[PDB]
């Protein structure tokens, strides 16, 4: 059977922490002219298109331009966030 | 705000599912996973009547 929907209100960022952290890393890499600046830029681009909350860096593996290394970084940063 | 019928993702061809997911920044996944993800996205972004 066909399901009918009405689009919901323009939602705030579903992933404010990941956006913040990728932005911080992007800015740090840009300031230092580091080769990894593009990694963070590309990840931010795909993350901003994604409408669902992510529970972990591991879950974020489904996103374009989210490599194993970056997903691990997000997992590690998440641990630090709730530890502190 | 108009009525949007949810596409029948379960009968979509694999290449089309991939293109739909690309809109949301999502990489190609196993077919069942893609169908479930697109349904999840639709239900989060639309209120069912």
UniProtKB/Swiss-Prot annotation, chain B:
Subcellular localization(s) per the UniProt record: Nucleus
Assembly behavior: Forms a heterodimer with SLX1A/GIYD1. Interacts with ERCC4/XPF; catalytic subunit of the ERCC4-ERCC1 endonuclease. Interacts with MUS81; catalytic subunit of the MUS81-EME1 endonuclease. Interacts with MSH2; component of the MSH2-MSH3 mismatch repair complex. Interacts with TERF2-TERF2IP. Interacts with PLK1 and SLX4IP.
Linked residues for Glycyl lysine isopeptide (Lys-Gly) (interchain with G-Cter in SUMO2): 18-19
Family listed: Belongs to the SLX4 family.
Annotated protein name in UniProt: Structure-specific endonuclease subunit SLX4
Top-level lineage group: Eukaryota
Disease implicated: Fanconi anemia complementation group P: A disorder affecting all bone marrow elements and resulting in anemia, leukopenia and thrombopenia. It is associated with cardiac, renal and limb malformations, dermal pigmentary changes, and a predisposition to the development of malignancies. At the cellular level it is associated with hypersensitivity to DNA-damaging agents, chromosomal instability (increased chromosome breakage) and defective DNA repair. Some individuals affected by Fanconi anemia of complementation group P have skeletal anomalies.
Chain's role: Regulatory subunit that interacts with and increases the activity of different structure-specific endonucleases. Has several distinct roles in protecting genome stability by resolving diverse forms of deleterious DNA structures originating from replication and recombination intermediates and from DNA damage. Component of the SLX1-SLX4 structure-specific endonuclease that resolves DNA secondary structures generated during DNA repair and recombination. Has endonuclease activity towards branched DNA substrates, introducing single-strand cuts in duplex DNA close to junctions with ss-DNA.
């Amino acid at each position: 059977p066909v399901r009918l929907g009405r689009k919901r209100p323009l939602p705030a960022c579903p992933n404010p922490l990941f956006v913040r952290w990728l932005t911080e890393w992007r800015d740090e890499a840009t300031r230092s002219r580091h080769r990894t600046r593009f990694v963070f830029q590309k990840a931010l681009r795909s993350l901003r298109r994604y409408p669902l909350p992510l529970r972990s860096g591991k879950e974020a593996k489904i996103l374009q331009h989210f490599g194993d290394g970056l997903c691990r970084m997000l997992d590690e940063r998440l641990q630090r966030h709730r530890t502190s | 705000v108009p009525i949007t019928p949810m596409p029948q993702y379960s009968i979509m061809e694999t290449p089309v599912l991939k293109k739909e997911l690309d809109r949301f920044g999502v990489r190609p996944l196993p077919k069942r996973q893609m169908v479930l993800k697109l349904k999840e996205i639709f239900q989060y972004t639309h209120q069912t009547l």
